[PDB]
Amino acid sequence: VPEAELLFKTPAFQPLTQNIPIKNESKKLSKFHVKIEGEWFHGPPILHVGPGETIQYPLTFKPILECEIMGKLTLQNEVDGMAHIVEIDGIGTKPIALDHIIIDCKVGKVTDKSIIVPNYTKSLLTFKVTSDLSIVWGNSFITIEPDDSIPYTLHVCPWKRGTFKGAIMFFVKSYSEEKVKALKIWYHLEIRSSPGPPVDIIELHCIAL
Amino acid sequence: NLFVMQVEMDVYTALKKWMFLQLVPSWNGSLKQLLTETDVWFSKWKKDFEGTTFLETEQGKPFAPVFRHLRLQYIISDLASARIIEQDSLVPSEWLAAVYKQQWLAMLRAEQDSEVGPQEINKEELEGNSMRCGRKLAKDGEYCWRWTGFNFGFDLLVTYTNRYIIFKRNTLNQPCSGSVSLQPRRSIAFRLRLASFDSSGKLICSRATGYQILTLEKDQEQVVMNLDSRLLIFPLYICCNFLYIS
Amino acid sequence: NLFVMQVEMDVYTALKKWMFLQLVPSWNGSLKQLLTETDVWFSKWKKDFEGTTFLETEQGKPFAPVFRHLRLQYIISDLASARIIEQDSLVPSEWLAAVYKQQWLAMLRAEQDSEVGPQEINKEELEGNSMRCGRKLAKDGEYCWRWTGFNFGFDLLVTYTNRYIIFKRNTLNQPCSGSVSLQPRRSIAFRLRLASFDSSGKLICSRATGYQILTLEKDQEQVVMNLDSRLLIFPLYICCNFLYIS
Amino acid sequence: QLSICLSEEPEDHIKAAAAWALGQLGRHTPEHARAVAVTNTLPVLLSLYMSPESSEDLQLKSKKAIKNILQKCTYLPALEPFLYDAPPNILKHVVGQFSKVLPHDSKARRLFVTSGGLKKVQEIKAEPGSLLQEYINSINNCYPEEIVRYYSPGYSDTLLQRV
Amino acid sequence: APPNILKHVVGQFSKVLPHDSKARRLFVTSGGLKKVQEIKAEPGSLLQEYINSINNCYPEEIVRYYSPGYSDTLLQRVD
């Protein structure tokens, strides 16, 4: 009954090493395996148990973006199939300025660009949009599941070859709802339309050499 | 205390349809049609990911614990259900083979053991793993049925006639393509539950005959129940429980 | 093409005596002590080394394949052989579980899944699914019997008729010791080989039925086979092969 | 009662109203169409639709009811007779329902094969790109290719050129 | 012809059919090879080799097709 039971707390890209020791109920050949639903929760398949020792099963977590992940752990023993249900978070703080919108388009190509938007709450976040440009409006209505930084689709292009300037931001629908509604995120864009309709024509006659 | 109308088969059918619904909330079809959508989605999806079991490759979170807490032993008695579960492997293959072999042990009970049913209060197994069966009524009066499932070597007749629940074994009268055996004495551990509500959802009733054991013989007449419908709220709904193995 | 004397269970009983003598040819006893102490010592071995059958152990390594090659699905086609082999635990219990699932699917087919069976020449399955069975004729006579094999409620009549054999079904000839089914029709196919030996097992005579067809509603018949009084030179031998399931 | 009115009433608008009510009943969940089909109304509607003496409105409402019922009916024995008596513009729903029901049942596939309905299905043309084409393809995928070829038109001539 | 006469005919066919394609086509179209398959032969008698030589002049699919019980054979391979 060892109690060095720990739960992960780490930022993005930082490999954290913590210990999860457990005391089992029955006694036979002690070889143990885990089933995981949850990403970055990589670990070896096999571990053995010694003299009732404070022993821990390896499992990694290396987040790459501005997210969190709940770990689902269903446990399985080789002899009988015993389990010991513990669930742990895994957090990452990697903003590429949260995300940027880069588009290479032609005249009239309203491009759909992905926006990596974080979700540091445990409720289904549902943002509303107010922008001073009609050419930049969201995919119907942005909604993001908790924990992970699920991206979003945005339609961005001017009606001609040019640049319409506009400020677009996201406020939330309802861990705390205050942190929920304080995640007032504004995203910067980048547009590259390309030619394009021609107008003028000139014909000439030249000389070689 | 779920009011089951009637068995766990359609219970798991609804569980799997709602499995699809909450796994794929982008669907907006019909609910009886939801059988078709759920079966197509899941069957074809595993046909894409065969060999591997069901839940491993990013399937439903909230319902896997429910299904591994389920009373999965009697649901797939239908061979079409067995083919579908081999096509879907919602349970891991090791426990799937365990289920198949314990169903074979049920065969062995029926043939070798001449299994007689629960002679004592098996309430722990009743609350955990036994089956439930009940009916809804559009009117007060007569509702009878021949009972089947894992019949060993017989059949069962249970009636509901103006609130008079008859139990009698069918080994002699109502035919079927099944089997008949020499098993004389058949018993069950059973309970009847009632609790009434209104149109909006307010419940003001509760009835239970207590978790008891019934012991019956080949085509034996046995009836114990009485109620009053001017008191109860119709369309009435009645949930009964049973267990059949020792 | 083994003249089975007289059922596959007898085959495996002889092979069990043989495996025991392969393992323990120490003392100088006889066959009856061989069989009795063989059962006792196999049970004792299973108790000594649990979680593992003998064929998966040291001296049984050469004998694990030679017993994998047998008709392991037809010795346990007897009801009692399942409990016998589980008490002895010679064939691996995972092998037993797999073949038990096979027999479970077999009863599912025979009782539920519109069982058609072999209508005609499915020869490989008819070597993997027909019941090898016969009798030695120390003296000629008429011999008929009932066989409640793994036809799952269905029952069999096999009738040797003094140089000729009648292929039939058993539903109206004898009430059962176990269970019987109300199965209307089972379309089958069968082979029979009758061979007159040179007394000591030397053979210069053998006759097969080629391979034939039989449908089986309640006690249906088929009789095409020929021997004579000269071919009765004792010991005369019988070997029947019947398959009812796909 | 709707079947009785459709049958015994000699009047045309009464039959049309009965057909319209039946179609509105059968446009809901497949249980509705199953309960309607078991009453033997679809053959009557089909016969009245192909009846020259029937009025324009009667045939229109009968066709609408057939479209609204067969789009949800799952009772295969009821849809089986339509394979030999329905016009091509109606067989699409029957083939779609079969392709939706057959993959999830083995006994029904056995019954369909033993009744020789897949012969007729192979004997029905479809646009290369229409929903009927994909329905027929799904029908053929429920069985091994040997069965499909054996039940395909020209397979007798395929044997002829083969042997 | 009785079976004790059919041996000469089958031998003549097994000697003539290999060196002509039109005769084989006529024999197949007349459905004579099916009757030949319907004729039994002792496992070792000259009639058996004559029958085998008759079959060898055609692809095995054709011989199987005209073999007795071939349609039922297809029915059971379906099963």
Side-chain angles (χ1 to χ4, degrees), chain B residues 76-79 82-83 86 97 100-101 103-108 110-112 152-153 175-183, chain C residues 76 79-80 82-83 93 97 100-101 103-105 107-109 111-113 150 152-153 176-184:
Chain B
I76 55 176
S77 299
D78 184 72
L79 181 46
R83 285 194 177 99
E86 291 281 354
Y100 312 146
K101 72 179 180 181
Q103 298 325 112
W104 180 245
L105 273 295
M107 294 298 103
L108 301 186
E111 289 286 348
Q112 328 173 338
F152 302 77
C176 174
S177 63
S179 303
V180 292
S181 181
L182 297 165
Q183 306 144 341
Chain C
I76 70 165
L79 193 68
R83 77 208 75 163
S93 288
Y100 286 166
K101 174 187 175 176
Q103 308 312 277
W104 164 258
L105 298 171
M107 62 69 55
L108 292 167
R109 293 196 295 183
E111 292 274 43
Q112 310 169 7
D113 190 65
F150 275 179
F152 300 109
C176 183
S177 59
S179 315
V180 290
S181 181
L182 310 180
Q183 186 68 250

Side-chain angles (χ1 to χ4, degrees), chain B residues 214-228:
Chain B
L214 184 56
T215 295
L216 303 183
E217 190 46 42
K218 288 179 172 175
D219 305 67
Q220 174 188 341
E221 307 85 9
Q222 167 67 22
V223 190
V224 288
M225 184 278 287
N226 179 84
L227 272 178
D228 292 320

Side-chain angles (χ1 to χ4, degrees), chain D residues 61-147:
Chain D
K61 290 190 175 181
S62 304
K63 187 170 188 173
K64 289 181 178 179
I66 289 177
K67 293 181 61 179
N68 296 135
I69 291 178
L70 302 196
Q71 66 178 3
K72 295 298 179 180
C73 184
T74 62
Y75 198 82
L76 299 192
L79 308 182
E80 181 180 357
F82 275 88
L83 276 73
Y84 308 96
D85 300 324
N89 48 18
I90 303 300
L91 301 165
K92 46 178 183 180
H93 304 267
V94 185
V95 176
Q97 289 295 330
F98 268 101
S99 59
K100 288 178 181 180
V101 176
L102 286 181
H104 302 109
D105 49 36
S106 181
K107 307 174 183 176
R109 293 194 301 268
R110 299 306 174 272
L111 181 60
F112 197 67
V113 169
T114 50
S115 60
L118 72 165
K119 291 282 192 173
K120 189 59 180 180
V121 173
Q122 293 293 336
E123 293 174 1
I124 296 171
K125 296 182 177 180
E127 301 182 1
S130 61
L131 305 179
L132 185 59
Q133 182 67 27
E134 290 96 42
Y135 291 158
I136 294 179
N137 300 329
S138 177
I139 283 292
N140 310 333
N141 297 334
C142 302
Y143 310 99
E145 190 275 333
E146 301 173 353
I147 308 178

Side-chain angles (χ1 to χ4, degrees), chain B:
Chain B
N1 294 278
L2 166 78
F3 286 98
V4 188
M5 301 320 197
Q6 193 190 50
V7 297
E8 315 291 338
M9 183 278 288
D10 50 354
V11 168
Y12 196 57
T13 307
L15 295 178
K16 183 181 180 180
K17 292 191 299 181
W18 171 57
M19 186 66 203
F20 167 75
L21 193 146
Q22 283 282 12
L23 198 150
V24 187
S26 59
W27 167 87
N28 62 332
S30 179
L31 208 77
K32 186 163 184 175
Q33 179 203 57
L34 179 55
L35 188 140
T36 297
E37 280 98 11
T38 296
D39 294 337
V40 164
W41 204 98
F42 283 49
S43 306
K44 175 255 178 183
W45 174 92
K46 182 171 183 288
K47 286 160 186 173
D48 312 330
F49 301 97
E50 269 291 337
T52 309
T53 46
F54 176 77
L55 304 156
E56 298 193 22
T57 45
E58 301 294 334
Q59 284 305 94
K61 293 172 175 55
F63 312 149
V66 164
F67 294 167
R68 60 214 177 206
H69 305 348
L70 265 187
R71 62 189 71 247
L72 305 156
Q73 43 270 22
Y74 325 113
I75 298 183
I76 55 176
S77 299
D78 184 72
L79 181 46
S81 299
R83 285 194 177 99
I84 291 179
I85 208 174
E86 291 281 354
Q87 173 201 62
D88 297 349
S89 297
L90 312 165
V91 183
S93 297
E94 70 278 14
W95 190 255
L96 274 187
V99 165
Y100 312 146
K101 72 179 180 181
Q102 62 193 108
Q103 298 325 112
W104 180 245
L105 273 295
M107 294 298 103
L108 301 186
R109 288 252 200 173
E111 289 286 348
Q112 328 173 338
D113 194 20
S114 302
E115 199 275 329
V116 298
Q119 294 298 112
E120 177 142 48
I121 303 285
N122 194 12
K123 208 271 165 187
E124 180 165 340
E125 185 177 1
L126 273 154
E127 185 78 13
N129 318 312
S130 78
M131 61 70 67
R132 307 166 285 185
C133 67
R135 192 190 192 96
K136 179 187 176 182
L137 276 72
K139 67 183 182 296
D140 181 22
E142 175 72 31
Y143 278 104
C144 186
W145 49 83
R146 66 185 298 271
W147 186 76
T148 51
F150 182 63
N151 286 334
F152 302 77
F154 44 80
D155 183 294
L156 181 58
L157 316 170
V158 170
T159 316
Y160 183 103
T161 184
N162 290 272
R163 283 79 54 81
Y164 188 73
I165 293 173
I166 310 178
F167 317 103
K168 185 168 184 176
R169 178 176 165 174
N170 164 23
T171 306
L172 311 173
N173 60 10
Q174 184 65 249
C176 174
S177 63
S179 303
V180 292
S181 181
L182 297 165
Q183 306 144 341
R185 174 62 70 188
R186 270 309 305 180
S187 303
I188 50 175
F190 85 108
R191 183 214 59 178
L192 197 71
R193 153 174 169 79
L194 181 59
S196 301
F197 63 91
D198 61 353
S199 64
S200 65
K202 179 69 174 66
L203 180 144
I204 55 170
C205 173
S206 61
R207 171 190 171 85
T209 70
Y211 292 92
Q212 295 179 356
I213 50 171
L214 184 56
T215 295
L216 303 183
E217 190 46 42
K218 288 179 172 175
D219 305 67
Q220 174 188 341
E221 307 85 9
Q222 167 67 22
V223 190
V224 288
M225 184 278 287
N226 179 84
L227 272 178
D228 292 320
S229 58
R230 284 71 174 168
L231 202 161
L232 312 174
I233 296 89
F234 267 71
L236 195 59
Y237 57 99
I238 304 97
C239 182
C240 204
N241 311 109
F242 293 96
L243 191 49
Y244 313 93
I245 196 168
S246 302

Side-chain angles (χ1 to χ4, degrees), chain A residues 119-152:
Chain A
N119 193 325
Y120 277 123
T121 65
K122 294 194 175 182
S123 62
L124 182 54
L125 296 178
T126 310
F127 293 165
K128 190 199 159 191
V129 175
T130 52
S131 179
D132 51 350
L133 277 188
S134 62
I135 69 161
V136 291
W137 80 104
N139 170 33
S140 302
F141 200 68
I142 183 168
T143 304
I144 302 175
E145 293 285 348
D147 294 355
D148 197 18
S149 174
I150 296 189
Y152 180 56

